[model samples]
Target: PVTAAPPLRLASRNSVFTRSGAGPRYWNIYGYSFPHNAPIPENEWKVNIDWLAGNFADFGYDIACTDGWIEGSSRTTGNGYITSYNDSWQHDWAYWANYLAARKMKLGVYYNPLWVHRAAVEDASKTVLGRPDVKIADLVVPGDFFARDIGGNQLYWLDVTKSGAKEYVQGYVRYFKDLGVPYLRIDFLSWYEDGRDANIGQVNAPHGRANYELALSWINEAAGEDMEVSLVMPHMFQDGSAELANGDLVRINADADKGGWDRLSGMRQNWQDAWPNWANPFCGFTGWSHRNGRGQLILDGDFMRASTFASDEERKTMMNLMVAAGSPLAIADTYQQIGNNAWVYTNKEVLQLNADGLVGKPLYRSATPFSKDPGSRDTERWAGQLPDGSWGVALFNRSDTETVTKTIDFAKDLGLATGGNVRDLWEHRNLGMDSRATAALAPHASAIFRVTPPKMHGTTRYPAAFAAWGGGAGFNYNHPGYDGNGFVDGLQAGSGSADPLVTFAVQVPHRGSYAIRYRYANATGDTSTMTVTAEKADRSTVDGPVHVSFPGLATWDTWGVADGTITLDAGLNLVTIGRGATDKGAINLNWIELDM
Candidate 1:
């Protein structure tokens, strides 16, 4: 028999305020344009310190990290030695750490794991235990090499696998530890070069993963397990295997450069992208940059609350999912510059939710099959248990502009019949529940409600359906059958077979009867055949191959649909998609939904 999980122990439910009564919730600020060879203004330093204190006092964020020193090392920088950059960073850290301590906030620093001094690399061979015989380019360690621009002519890579190089990294970690800092961010793991522009290769390499695991292991072993490591670059979610067991807070989305507002909004529109569907019950962290290049706040409260972006309701849903999925809230903002009040207030709520940390696991995620219609959008809502023995539901609107309304019966929808009070978190008001309730939401807007079940009985609710990507970080699309680039022309087609195959391995949450659904679109009338096969979590084929066909090339027309019953035990399952033939055609996948 299935049993429900136990209740959660709610964290403190108090508001965080600043020393000057600003706010005490968790907030972050970024340093803009670390100037070279110039003394910082006294007032600028004072203001920045005050901003840090105010954020701590107001938001209750105990951790703060500086962007770090290490500039003019890029290949374009004419200066060989970034001595001034290092000096400036040290100066800022000396001041920042003391100031944050005075404000009672923990401080962190940002540094690239692959950055190295040119002289260090040049002199490595002369140093003890240094393989001077091994040039950076010729060295093939268990990781990718990252080249930095420095002094107009020299490029360097910090190979962590090397004994001398490992010592160099340990020295930096020891330096920070001596500075009394607790957390640090390791950036630019994705820029490793394989004899090309750092940005142009496949994002993940087996060696890169090995290198990252080794580097992180060294840091954790040296800095102690309490240290927080934020992984930037290399799309944290896509590297799930390297991260799942690491205990570090991983970013589930791409970096700020890849997709900013559009990416965040896109994830909201496609609920499946965020893994908040019934088949995939776990949720991971999502990020947003509140300001622009000029240190001006770009995503405001109204913008955040707007139906076009992520509405208040959607934000609440995301929060619930994160809590249930055992993920942390990592928000990106600039503390160096303070912005609007509304933005601050909204951020406060987010901080409070994170601090409470009592929302249990996700209950279910519904699937929205894609459509060829340009106006097609998907709406998915979820229900989970709050710490207070109250049931919470989050309704997300995925459309761009059109508002959607759905009638929900708590008893029927959530398997609870007795009606109780329902409250809208964003609206900050109570909504009485009945036999049925209608929810009205604008585009990208979501509503979170607290509900009370009818009967008070002890019961267990084990997750029945499991539909998630094989690895934690993300799935790789570089396989022979899957086409990474959407473009399909005669010349490119001639280079390789147009038949594309996309493979996914799902970790089943439990053993039960299951149904699978997905959406695909093809613009050209090229007849496409799709085959779905199930395999074990270890990538071994399990079930029979299910095949479906789309008849005509309708622009953006929905191509295939397949569903069947299967008894899945508690383990991993692989789902693979194979395209029949190569035509002047391209396929776009919305998402896959599974019911158990």
Candidate 2:
């Protein structure tokens, strides 16, 4: 038998997201250009960061970040050491990061853990710590040299497998920390592992994998476990062990946008190349974990092409898909277009889709993760269910040549009833009496929808709401894949506090007796213990502080059921899941099924 896990007692648990430093507000630059010249002048750099602060600050779209060519050891300019991506006059990073941080936003920057191949000068100054005598000498690999690149002595891939690799990466990790930056985006990790097209010589595979792992270990040590690492442009088939251990996120989409997007970057010559391979509007959703907390690390679906995508429908379609997948907003729009484009970012529920910190489970099965090619010539689609019992839907037409009307059947597709209330998630309008609906989209445009569950009356299956957290901060809000299918964690682990306790709000239509059936985890055979009680709206007891003891897992492995009868006084009631402050071990509670 197992006892009930103690309830949760938490503080400041309500944050930008479930975690303090982690949130949905991610703003990135590097869309218009590849990384040769600065986006603007040193003095003019403030134009962009200020644009972000002025335009989208209120929507939780924080974190001003940049990607693409931002590194060059020998490079310098007037901008306090040219943290700039190009050789031009870039402003000091202090001004850029502090400008945003002063505004209460965090700063994120991009870097590569592998090579300096993009440099123009003969750059083999970095060497293997163990074998400094080894000459880079355009050192050709036996088969593949991790990533692909052959420069005229001006560029070269560092031998991460060599002795000095860890120290080299640790140097940069220390640099980012010294700069007071919290988020670091590492590019080309996949290239260093599998090379291009997932075709690499077997002879070099071992060294390639080792280099990635060893380099990250150094980064982890130097960051003092305080930084967030995002692994970008990684391939599908490459081993995820290194990233799984040290990375906070992995990029799942191919290069879909021009290097840096502006109001017109998406309309450039090869702009359509963004989708030529997977058109991956929904590919990132496949990696969604069972819950929002630390199950599988979150993913980077890449940036939103707001500036180039001409159709609002297409923009909404892409943004909706990203939100459902619980990815970063990473907007790459023309910051100046804020006033007229309010319709583009201000959808209340769409914003909440991110704030809830819940990721959408995959809706498509054929959305294979590893693809041999780069572009998908079919219609792009995305779907997921939010914790609030609402469904998020998106359908896109990537045919830059023709328009397409996609069909959406709630019953046949999402397992919902035939006719129900379906709202246009982007337009914020209702499609009354709708079951099977068709949406027409322009070329490269998409349609997004939010479908609600049919109304329920008797025997409500009350879900665990974000009432309050007790015990410590490690407890997550809607951690999926446990009893009641999803519940608050109560283990007094890692979080430097007592075991957790929780409270849920349940509504009753009339005063009567109801059986509170709790679905919990009890994988361990031994009996466990915890206290459960119910309180009426008037602060009166509706049931005894009953104790529950049942068979439970030594860890969170499976679900079990427990029941207690409660007298209700209708309207509102509070159910507490805890024994007391001194209470220690308790079984996990996913949700409770209340029926008469």
Candidate 3:
């Protein structure tokens, strides 16, 4: 078994399929099999199933997935494939699948075929199902262990390039398919990819990317057209070139071990374009925005434990982001454990966004996949285009003690030419006609608005508070002359390293030159010059330091205007105004108005 790579079947895209078949998507309920190796009791499973079928079936939470405990005890068929799991369960796989089917639901199994039970690996009697000549040990990597087992069951990584390795992996998936299982949560893939784990520094199988691709291909090939595959703990290397092409869903964040603000959004972590991303779902989704579209990889934010949250606002905030990201709305808490927080999953309007496959993009993102930048990224605002030419925009205040007001201009922020009436998805109320949406959000609160635009286009104004501020620049909401929410202050006059800078992530319908009007105030001098530059999102194009002079106002509260033109690419443009090394003078910024 300690040999070079063998001939293998190539991976294909035709094997790819999502549980969501274009419309009428489904969610899941899990966590009965969690905490790594805890055993699953029959009574616990039945109680949760009965509760979910009675209360949440109509709301589309139609899948009951098994978690870690499925590995407690297992039985193998004569063909060397898994036949039964969790010895406590008296009935067969058909009994469980039929029970869920009778109640109008499906079963999702949490298992990875790349792993071989330690007993099966040691027993020379265990041979590949279809290839009787190939022993299970021959397919396994010749090592003590690949990685530490989560459920305490002894298991080792299979050398996917072995003689009967394909048969072993494919036959395992076929067994689940024959049992009428519709979803497979294939996890711990990163360990097989490079033998890396947090708890265990390194293990045996450094199979690398090619072997990982072969393993996934065999899994998908056996899954057929009906089954949905979900990948967990994946490297997602090269922007998920392997996982996205095979799996319908990929876990983007860590396990929702103790679901709360700290795990959701409170943690401070930079976005990296790799796997084992320890940050929350916000960072993971933001890092993978390049593939946010239909028929692409569906982002999974792990499970939702409603009872674990501190307040209803935090719960809704989590729900809104998951829906906006078009991810699986998995509920981790059981009926008795979830308490009275069932309202978190029952919002019909918010749930529709997911059903329609509307994946929102964050306000700011690196055009390059897996790009690591030093600048702080913003995760508070998200927006996506809907199927019917409308847009779904979500704004969140991640603070715990302060209320943050957010303003979103439809044309500038979301790339919509015209605007329509804003309907609040959570409150279920129409907020009237408008080109812009403004929300005074409480701590941990979030809002999702459905904006149905009209035909005609119009001018758009972006508030200074909406821009990304850096280099000593700060928001001044106490100032009186600001229009939308607040103004930006501390624009240093000299060409110093710490000069204030404000960058706006703007979107337009087409590529061309556009006139921009700057709204600012300068009582310190008669005239002030602000340096403005425009760069394409991909950094392919850059338009210069257009020196726009601001006429001084009588007082600090009074505002003045200056005009400049900059070239921008169609989709996303970064227009930054700052006291650059070649520029001089300073002025307080209030807003910027642009013509389409």
Candidate 4:
């Protein structure tokens, strides 16, 4: 629903959650979900970059990156950098950066405070990404060894204030920027989120609050004035401190699966937050503890992977939750697999919420009850209105036992007195709303609605009113269109025996016939065919799969308007639009305007 905003600011972090730095669609590696061994194969390295650029880049889902693949057990840190020996796995950083750049995308990488091998840092190999010459006694607090790596190697936390420690870490960040990559992630923030020294398993750490600031200062200095950095594993810092330091995204939940739609049921399904459902922060604290939408930054709802393993319904729900929290939309599954799940990301209706141009604020205003136990009644709701007037609401039925109809009074749930049309973004239905609204969600299943103001008529509806079928559908591309100014359906390939279909929910003031003008393009043949159907509330198909032939334009890039008639029942009616009997041959739809 949003596009056409400010010029793209490459890595500018000054304003509120600047969408300039390759919109935060956190598409990083799956190494954290998997163990340390499954690095993306060296031969197929370009696959990730190409897949994202070809499919998601245009939608601002750029930032193709890797996680847990570098700083291996085989590498050692010495004078300055970690000497890599994983010849079969690693690529020159700049080499991969070019792959992204060629696709008009940016490159990013993941890291933990413990960047290199622990054995070397403890003096065995004397190697690490930071200064290896800097001794542990000199680089960290006395009892800094915090956690162990996958290979049972001990990992230590860096004392950010120590002598030369800040400079070494800053220099390490500069190396990546020098290597042609500007985006970076310093993960496992639990070491800092909660007063660091007080972090569990610590001997006597510092009040994490100050340490991360100093750490980010050094990192930001190295990352250049323009560059995006996400803080992963943050235990608590949702207070917009990251924004003060130019930090962009923060991890808000626990370790999520790279293959399933378990969808952060709590803060950490593994760590188990102090309160019930605390693992999933939004469950208790809507919109990162109801932070003011000054556009500081977004919560990293870990990474998402609904396509590979979740049900269609589950997948949409997962995405809505991410949008509700303004989390960087992440699809952690394989690149090719997205081919099968393309519909999920291609749904411009939902994906648009992550637009860098839009800023989201929690719907709950002052004097709201923060649900401590989102699992009980679990019947809580989360909604946010974008900088645009459009509202993206996540209606949750977080119950495992019963279904419920959560009333979403516009003024109460969203703080707006909206009395206009509402469309279910996930299911692609124009819910034909009344003056009031209520969402009936099945236990645990969720619903996402995009409520458009009545004045929104005549405007371009991207991806063609949802419920699209067959060879890809059409949506307003915004730029210099295929020809110029209109939607394009150029995604899917040609097939002989397939029929394309589409549908929309149209509202009629009274029961009557109406002519709907469809501005579209179809250059597949001299003429195009369409099978239109209008169904009443009683499920009566009033019209066709009936064939209507419209003359084709000069090419697929051209647009033509044709009127189709259908009798719509007074309040709301479901209208199905499809290609006629003959191969539905590329009827690229652009926009629809109903004339009574």
Candidate 5:
């Protein structure tokens, strides 16, 4: 007798749970490598597994699917190769299953169902019981065969579309079940002509509603009522009767096979574009890249860089989307690549967002497209419900041309008007708010805030202002080499020949104490000196020049809160970066972060 598990309640239609949902998922970084017989060292394997378990275990993932096992030998007519079925492949599975189980993780395996054992005694039972007129082989389709790679001589696709085809799958399922496996992933949907013909199995075509229905039936049959199923290479989402009932989880985005921080952008796009279309919301899917090779090295070093190649603003936008959508955070770097506790540890702030369990929902999308100048738009805004009753909001400037002011009225928009306390989650600083709050955001810059209802009401005040600017590209002279004229190594400089200067501007919402930090990188041994100037929103300039200098080779220098006080009203103010006439080194400005 079978007992049923408790029924899970779906997210309510009007609840924040339904709006933001759950997710920000991770996938196995190396599921495919083992099956390919790739040279994965034992030490590397241990490190990879440990990192995954320790770092991301709290996300509540249920299964990790291993790549397919390649059967080395095929059955032949006279050879009667039953012994081949008990090859090294079975032992490998045992090793993998034990490792996963020890970590409290379930194992998922992949296999084709039509393949059969050549010499099993069961082959003699070809006639259907009680239906003597029908031999199982008589009903089998000739083209429905499993292809065996036979020593370079020929590739045979064996036909097994007979009355007993279901038996082959049953045998494999029982084998894995006896070994204690609880999940299975199947591939090559019936829509493919090479497997079960979609035309003949019209009811099972991998298209529309039928595709999902048939897949569920096949998985339930193969796994024998107790196993969980996940589909790959096919589109799956969280909402929908078929998906909610049949699929435990599904891939919300495409795999990130290429290396780079840009892969983060791709992940964000998947959420914004795909998740809304599903009738039943799904948790996010796993995304990862293949390892570089046998040793513990990951091919992309940028994956290790704490400050990504993307601007701080771009990164915030991506993070905002992930949070709003409730996607999981999974990285493909090997344990060695993450290194021994440097930036990775300090960078816990980014990962902590995933742990909070709040799915991000868009508050507002920019009507202006990317083709516009940064000065052309104000800010792209998003919101999500935090684990606590409070709401989290993120504001981003999408234009690359000009600095703009973004205004938010919590009371009117979020129904928090009685008064609320605002905090900057990234900087861990408190930002007191008014009836209407405005931020001066640079082109491609952003600000994230967490809002809590006030304990008592008069408007609270906090010192903060946002600013951004534009300037000619500047060069980092120490690295490779760049002169005022051009890059010595022919590489392009940051500020081209137009002027050795960068621009900064902000529209202040409220005035208080403010601090700004600038990061610049230099590889070559050259002295770089630049001046920073502050301006009020009314186009009035502050008195003195804030001096900044990069003194040596291959390093980053941060200028901490070069302090100054000024009254700012509601308008645009400009801050400029100018290279002194005598300054000779190339300097590449990384970012400028401001806080109160």
Candidate 6:
């Protein structure tokens, strides 16, 4: 018999999972550094740092990060950790860290550990820092240079199975930790993982998946509790298991790359793209929704080049979606480059949702993750519950030339009762209370709102997509005829133990009788019944495994409604829908609603 792993206690210091207030907010002038691909001039660095410190430090942009290609000598510690970082500013890593520290900011270092500079390996005298018996070359395969195209520099890949591999990889992290660095942007992980990419040339044999997992594990363990690790260009395989369990943040999409609509959303994209190919963050977030949420993984949409957007409306849409996805808010545009668009970053009302770490759910998700249908999964509307039991919703019109109008029907769309006050998040003003929210958006525009519903009564809705499911219950969106984006299927009547179940976590204002309604599709050509159970927070049963029957709708594309009743508690309740062991037939569920 095998025992299950205990739940993870994600409480690392500076981890996005445990961070409060404005989390991982930073101003990375790395975009400026990338164009030069070299250490920025001392005067330029100071000027940008001074301006950022003076203007945006109060707004929580507290990290000064460096991108790739910082000019430096080929220096390495005895253990093979690079200590030879000196830019055009004639400042080493320590000086940069101290400079930022004086201004109450942290230094974010961009470096990949698996990368062994050819110069370092060529010197046969060096050995693993702590293990003097192990030479540096012992950690890698002979003459194997991985991703030779990067910076025109010869970098070797480490063989994780080697004896000194752990000491070398983990020691590099410790070197940065000792330098007072709090954040690290580890890039080119996919190159090291399996040589999977479109740009970089793959020279050596693949590092294999197990080795990649081992390397990430070593980095996480060595990062300790103080350092935050951001993974770039990583294969977040198995729905982000390797990255989610190890790093604080994972880049979900291709580079924001100068922040245009094409790079952000317009370009042809896919659910998962190998390196070099691009998938806009908008499509990236929707496809990866299964692995994203509050207290879950923090999605990274790359840097925000505020002024590079085609229009002010486009800029707002990009920022709103990032916050709605609970992604990192990285300002890539410099003080000089941002021009008058600084308001995009300084909106306290909108930034507050980010501070609270609220991750909204899409009204509909693409039916499949690996789809050839490029833009099918990118839903235009999303809503997430706020800290005070309210909700924050974002509506986007991604069309480049078409003016689109979208509506959020409180009852039909959000699964909430009618009559919720709608406040425009971007405009920072209340539009008054209403039964629904409708907005007309120009091309590449968006609107986000805070919906505060009146005390719960009358009826409430719950979409199957947001519910917690287990066992054989699966999602479907291939059929476009269903209501919402997709429906829950595979609800075969199982054993009464509730192994296969769809559970909705809901809150009610008062405990009383509420008519339960289920939107389903039954094409079995016969009547079918499902079992429903309501449980209190403590796991005690509040309602029976009542059997609700549904008449077949003839075809799978047709939808029908089935109604029943269950008593809910005053606060949180877990209402589960499944099939009893003796129940017959399987039905597809679109949503569940409760009416008083």
lDDT of candidate 4 over 1-596, digit per residue (tens)? 11112111111133323323113674666732253356666554567667777777887677877776454434444533443223465655666777678888877777653333444445644433445555534565544454432222244566675666766676667766666665677775654444232224443233366666666666766665455667666554433444334566666555664445444553243223321224564442352433322223445666666555446766666666777666667767557456477676668877766652233333332222233332222225654443223456567766556887876565433333335578877678888865545688786678777765454452322224222222223333443233212343432233333333444445556777776666677777676656566665344555554555567777665668876666666754555555433433556665455654
Question: By TM-score, how accurate is candidate 3?
Answer: 0.71
Runs of candidate 2 with Cα error greater than 4 angstroms are 3-23, 35-44, 71-87, 114-148, 152-168, 194-207, 220-226, 236-239, 259-279, 284-294, 335-342, 364-391, 395-423, 430-445, 449-596
Best by lDDT: 6
Lowest lDDT block of 10, candidate 2: 268-277
TM-score order of candidates, best first? 6, 3, 4, 2, 1, 5
Off by over 4 Å in 5: 1-21, 24-27, 30-44, 53-94, 100-211, 217-231, 235-245, 259-320, 339-356, 364-380, 396-409, 415-419, 432-448, 454-596
Predicted candidate 2 versus true structure: per-residue lDDT over 515-592, tens digit per residue:
666666654456555566666633467764656554555556566777767666575565666535544345665555
lDDT scores of the candidates, listed in order? 0.39, 0.51, 0.69, 0.52, 0.38, 0.70
Which of the two candidates, 1 or 5, achieves a greater TM-score against the reference?
1
Q: Write the per-residue lDDT of candidate 5 for residues 1-596, one digit (tens) a residue.
A: 11112111221111111112243233343433433345344444455666666664444443444433334433322211222222333335567667767887655554433334332213444443334444444433333333321122111222333444334335455556655666444443322222223112232212234434543544455564354344333332322334333333333333333433444333332222232221111112111100000010111111122233255455454444444344433333455444442233223444454445443333322222212322212225544434233455666665567897765666443334245567776677777755544568886666667666553322222111111111223212233221111111111123333233443333344544444454444545665555555554232455225445555554433222222333333333344444533444555553343332
Deviating ranges (above 4 Å) for candidate 3: 1-30, 33-37, 122-125, 144-153, 198-200, 272-274, 365-371, 374-377, 455-596
Kindly state the number of residue pairs that clash in model 1: 50
Model 4 spans > 4 angstroms off: 1-23, 31-37, 69-79, 82-87, 113-156, 180-182, 192-209, 237-246, 258-263, 266-277, 281-287, 307-310, 336-339, 356-379, 427-434, 454-596
Over all chains combined, what TM-score does candidate 1 have?
A: 0.52
The better-scoring model by lDDT among 2 and 6 is 6
Model 1: CA > 4 A from native? 1-26, 29-46, 72-86, 89-95, 119-155, 165-171, 174-178, 193-209, 235-239, 257-260, 267-338, 342-350, 358-392, 406-420, 433-438, 451-596
Estimated TM-score for each candidate: 0.52, 0.60, 0.71, 0.61, 0.45, 0.75
Ten residues in sequence with the least summed lDDT for candidate 4:
1-10
Candidate 3 lDDT tens digits, 1-596: 01111111112132324322222233333454554236667767778878878878779888777776445455666655655556677866778788989999877777898878777776788899879899887886656354544333377778776899888889889988888887888887887788676545664456788889888888877887767788998988865668855777788887777678888974655654446553688777665544444444667888888778899989999888887776778888886677888889988888777765566656652222334652333577777655334567898888778999987787555544457789999889999889888899999999998877764443555555434454555555455756644577777643333445665656677888887778888887677766676666333335665666678778888877787777766755667776544444568887776666
